[PDB]
Amino acid sequence: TTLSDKDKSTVKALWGKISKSADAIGADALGRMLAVYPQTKTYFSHWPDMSPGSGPVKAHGKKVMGGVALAVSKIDDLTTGLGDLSELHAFKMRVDPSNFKILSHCILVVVAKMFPKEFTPDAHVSLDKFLASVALALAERYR
Amino acid sequence: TTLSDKDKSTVKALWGKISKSADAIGADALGRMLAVYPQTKTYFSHWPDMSPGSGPVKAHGKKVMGGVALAVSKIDDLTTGLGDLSELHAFKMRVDPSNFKILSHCILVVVAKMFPKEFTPDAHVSLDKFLASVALALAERYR
Amino acid sequence: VEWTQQERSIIAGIFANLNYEDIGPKALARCLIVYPWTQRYFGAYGDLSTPDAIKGNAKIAAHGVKVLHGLDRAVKNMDNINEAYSELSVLHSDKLHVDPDNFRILGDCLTVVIAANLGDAFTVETQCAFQKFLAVVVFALGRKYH
Amino acid sequence: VEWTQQERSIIAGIFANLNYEDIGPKALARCLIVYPWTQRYFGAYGDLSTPDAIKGNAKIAAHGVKVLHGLDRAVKNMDNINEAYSELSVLHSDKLHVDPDNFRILGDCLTVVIAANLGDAFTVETQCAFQKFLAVVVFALGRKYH
Ligand code: HEM
Ligand code: HEM
Ligand code: HEM
Ligand code: HEM
């Protein structure tokens, strides 16, 4: 669904506060996705290790949050902004889009865990909407 | 996700073929939704009868498919076109939008059952994308 | 359904130290704000007009505590969750007409609230065990819908 | 999971009369077309570039039949479905790395194809029993993922 100007301002403000820890958030959220929802491990079987805190998890965590960083930059047109990443997911990795909601949830949990004061219900609703829009933008090129 | 030119023309062509039986498709789809996915019954407890072919189900099936007919009319801008319907679901009935996917599936099953020759995999992808777009348009005003 | 000893220990430990009057209201208010269709069921609970009103609503707060204590029977009867929630399932289905998808959504809100409360203590293992617990409870609560 | 005599009869009836060489390829081809990420597993199967290529692909057709016969063990063992699928669950998890969400999606495509085939015989009762059956099978196939 459409992000309001409030949603966008809220996400931009939250990102301002959390971006310094973006690598950690990525690594923790990705590690949690893999352990808590082991169905998602099916896309990562080529990795030597999938355990929390492992090299591949840390490295990929930073890449994923780099995509989230890109999304915040392109928040006014996520469809266009995330086109390349949609093409990669649709045609190279071919990730079932149902999984994007799982990662979204794990990112919210990690944000709440690391920034409890910042993560108010109001921040939560805008971030949840934002991640839902990111997931939709990633799904654009699939079909 | 966005509808291509192909999707729009495929949906309009299918609608042209099946619109004559819209009321029947609606009644059957709703009847099936309620029986097959009894969680959906929670929104209809005020009805005297929820069984397949019952008066309430027939009458509501009619309303639902008129909403679908409206979406076909406004296929180039579903956000704006379904805005009022979104407001009613958002604030009057307060239907958890997860249920829209359930009804969509039941519509597809009924269209397959009733129009097996017309409901090719090619029409199926486009109609599935369309109903996903309708679901998203209906969810627009919730938050 | 098959619990390890670590999982049992993790769950017991969470509930042993839980401040229900803190966590319960927070989880329910957050649910009502982030997923506002859940407000459907609380028309008799007074003012829910803005997120501030919801956060300040005493009746919602009291219900948050009640719901959270509703998880107690599961913690004390971890091997018999389906039977323990049987009556609560028919209540939500037949009397309250609560859409059971909302149980899942509340569970996610509770996870977020517990994570915020526990911080570093909400380890990956902790989240694994809590998610498993929630999944079983939410399934149990959906069982008697017909 | 409990079955009525009627649900057992409906399920046995569907499969007893099934044309596997017709239904199997149709369900799988439809899945690859409507939900194209499922193509990820079939990179050795030749041309899947277009709907026409998929519909005409003999290797995809043969696999559709195999998958549909994969359901026979559940029909024969309705009270022991989890155990019937333990080995196939391990296969799909550990050898094939198939995302189990795809099992759900294939079930929905199979439902559509069976409805198209049966017409008026695809009653509400039949759809209830078939959905319950698919839900149990899909759950069983996901059990050994870890
Ligand atoms: C929803 C938010 C997501 C974002 C922003 C995101 C972003 C990214 C980025 C930036 C890359 C690297 C692309 C490159 O190499 O240039 C990537 C790769 C990848 N992503 Fe996503 N991703 C997301 C969700 C997911 C999910 C949920 C899954 C699977 C469950 C997934 C599976 C993968 C895989 C398998 C790779 C390739 C990694 C490798 O081969 O080592 N992604 N993603
Ligand atoms: C394709 C998706 C859907 C469309 C196009 C649609 C359309 C409509 C329309 C046009 C109305 C009547 C509006 C009015 O008269 O004011 C309506 C009412 C309603 N809808 Fe939706 N609907 C959809 C999905 C659903 C779902 C999935 C549910 C619940 C599971 C639902 C629950 C209701 C309820 C409870 C009413 C009021 C019915 C009554 O009290 O008689 N709708 N819908
Ligand atoms: C998923 C975890 C949940 C648990 C463990 C739970 C448990 C309970 C319990 C123990 C009661 C008290 C019943 C009695 O006193 O007889 C109750 C009542 C109720 N619950 Fe649930 N509940 C849950 C989720 C929800 C959700 C998500 C909603 C709605 C969004 C909801 C709505 C209600 C309502 C409206 C009542 C009746 C309150 C009244 O007396 O007016 N519950 N629940
Ligand atoms: C109702 C759901 C399903 C059932 C009952 C089923 C059953 C089977 C069976 C019986 C086999 C052969 C095992 C053997 O040779 O011992 C198999 C293999 C396979 N399945 Fe599944 N399957 C299901 C869903 C899926 C889905 C959705 C996908 C992918 C989208 C998939 C991908 C595969 C692949 C790639 C193979 C190996 C084929 C090869 O070796 O070339 N299956 N499945």
Task: State how far the Cα of B35 lies from the Cα of B28, in Å rounded to an integer.
Answer: 11
Q: Which atom of ligand 1 is nearest to the CA of A102?
A: 27
Q: How far apart are CA C102 and CA C34, in angstroms?
A: 12
Establish whether residue D41 lines the binding site of ligand 4, counting it when its CB lies within 6 angstroms of any ligand atom. Answer: yes
Inspect the interface and report whether the beta carbons of C34 and A125 lie closer than 8 Å: yes
Q: Do A79 and B129 touch (CB under 8 A)?
A: no
Domains of chain A as residue ranges with CATH: 1-143 (1.10.490.10)
Q: Do chains A and B touch (3 or more CB pairs under 8 A)?
A: yes
Q: B36 and D128 in contact by Cβ < 8 A?
A: yes
Ligand 3 atom index nearest CA of C107: 1
Please give the residue of chain B at the shortest CA–CA distance from D126: B36
Nearest atom in ligand 2 to B66's CA:
10
Residues of each annotated binding site of D = 45, 63, 66, 92
Using the Cβ of B139 and the Cβ atoms of chain A, whether some distance falls under 8 Å is answered with yes
Distance from Cα C55 to the centre of ligand 3, integer Å = 18
Instruction: Report whether residue A93 contacts ligand 1, using a CB cutoff of 6 Å.
Output: yes
Phi, psi of A120 (to 5 degrees): -80, 165
Exposure string of B85-121, with b = 16+ CB inside 10 Å and e = fewer, is: bbeebbeeebbbbbbbebbbbbbbbbbbbbbbeebbb
D contact chains, 3+ CB pairs < 8 A:
A, B
**Does the beta carbon of D102 lie inside 6 Å of ligand 4?**
yes
Fold of D1-146: Globin-like (1.10.490)
Tokens of B40: 């959906």
How many other C-beta atoms can be found within 10 angstroms of the C-beta atom of residue B73? 11
What HEC string does D81-94 produce?
A: HHHHHHHHHHHHHH
User: Does C60 contact chain A (CB < 8 Å)?
Assistant: no
**Which residues, 6 or more positions from D90, have their beta carbon under 8 angstroms from its beta carbon?**
D144
Q: Is B113 annotated as a binding residue?
A: no
Closest by CA to D34, choosing from D96, D104, D89, D133, is D104
- CA–centroid distance, A131 to ligand 3, in Å, is 29
Find tokens 């969470």 and name the residue.
C14
Q: What is the C-alpha to C-alpha distance for residues B31 and C28, in angstroms, rounded to an integer? A: 33
How far, in Å, CA of C132 to CA of C7, rounded? 9
* C-beta atoms of D101 and A39 within 8 A: yes
Q: Who among C112, C119, C120 is closest to A108 (CB)? A: C112
Buried b vs exposed e over A49-73: b needs ≥16 C-beta within 10 Å? ebebebeebbebbbebbebbebbbe
The answer to whether B143 contacts C36, with C-beta atoms less than 8 Å apart, is yes
Backbone dihedral angles phi then psi of residue B49, each to the nearest 5 degrees? -145, 135
A109 interaction partners in chain C (CB closer than 8 Å)? 111-112, 115, 122, 127
Query: Where do we find the tokens 């009746």?
Result: C59
In three-state secondary structure terms, A2 is coil
Whether the CB-CB separation of A3 and A72 falls below 8 Å is answered with no
d(CA D68, CA D63): 9
Non-local CB neighbours of D51 within 8 Å, separated by 6+ positions: B121, B122, D33
**From the candidates C39, C101, C108, C138, which should be mutated to test the interface with B, based on the most B CB atoms within 10 A?**
C101
Q: 3-class DSSP state for residue B49?
A: coil
Structure token digits, residue B35: 């029986």
CA distance B66 to D42: 41
The span from the CA of A9 to the CA of C52, in Å, is: 19
* Closest ligand to residue C39's CA: 3
Residues of B in contact with D127 (CB under 8 A): 32, 35-36, 109
Distance between CA atoms of residues C90 and A38, nearest Å: 32
User: Is C51 within 8 Å of A122 when comparing Cβ atoms?
Assistant: yes
What angle, rounded to 10 degrees, do the helices at B98-114 and D101-118 form?
30
Sign of the alpha-carbon dihedral angle for B88, B89, B90, B95: positive
Pick B112's closest partner by Cβ from D55, D115, D120. Answer: D115
Tell me how far apart the terminal alpha carbons of chain A are, to the nearest angstrom.
19
B101–chain C Cβ distance below 8 A for any pair:
no
Q: Considering only CB atoms, which chain A residues are within 8 Å of D102? A: 96
Name chain C contacts of B93, Cβ cutoff 8 Å.
40
**3-class state of residue C88 by DSSP:** helix
Instruction: Indicate the burial class of A87 (C-beta count within 10 angstroms; 0-12, 13-18, 19 or more).
Output: middle
What distance in Å separates the CA atoms of residue A46 and residue B51, rounded to the nearest whole number?
A: 51
Write the DSSP string, A28-59. Answer: HHHHHHHHHSGGGGGG-TTSS--STT-HHHHH
Helix axes of A98-114 and A5-18: crossing angle, nearest 10 degrees:
60
Q: Looking at chain C from residue 87 to 146, which residues have their Cβ under 8 Å from any Cβ of chain A?
A: 108, 111-113, 115-120, 122, 124, 127-128, 131
Alpha helices in chain C, H assignment, sequence order: 5-17, 20-34, 51-56, 58-69, 72-76, 81-84, 86-90, 101-118, 124-142
Resolution reached, in Å? 1.7
Q: From ligand 4's centre to the CA of D70, what distance in Å?
A: 8
D50 C-alpha vs ligand 1 centroid, how far in Å?
25
- Residue A124 assigned as binding residue: no
Q: Does the beta-carbon distance from C122 to A113 stay under 8 Å?
A: yes
CA D36 to ligand 4 center in whole angstroms: 16
Task: Enumerate the known binding-site residues of C for heme b.
Answer: 45, 63, 66, 92
The dihedrals phi and psi of B141, each to the nearest 5 degrees, come to: -85, 5
Residue type, D134: L
Handedness of CA D36, D37, D42, D47 (dihedral sign): positive
| Residue B114 to residue C59: CA distance in whole angstroms | 50
CA of D124 to the centre of ligand 3 (A): 31
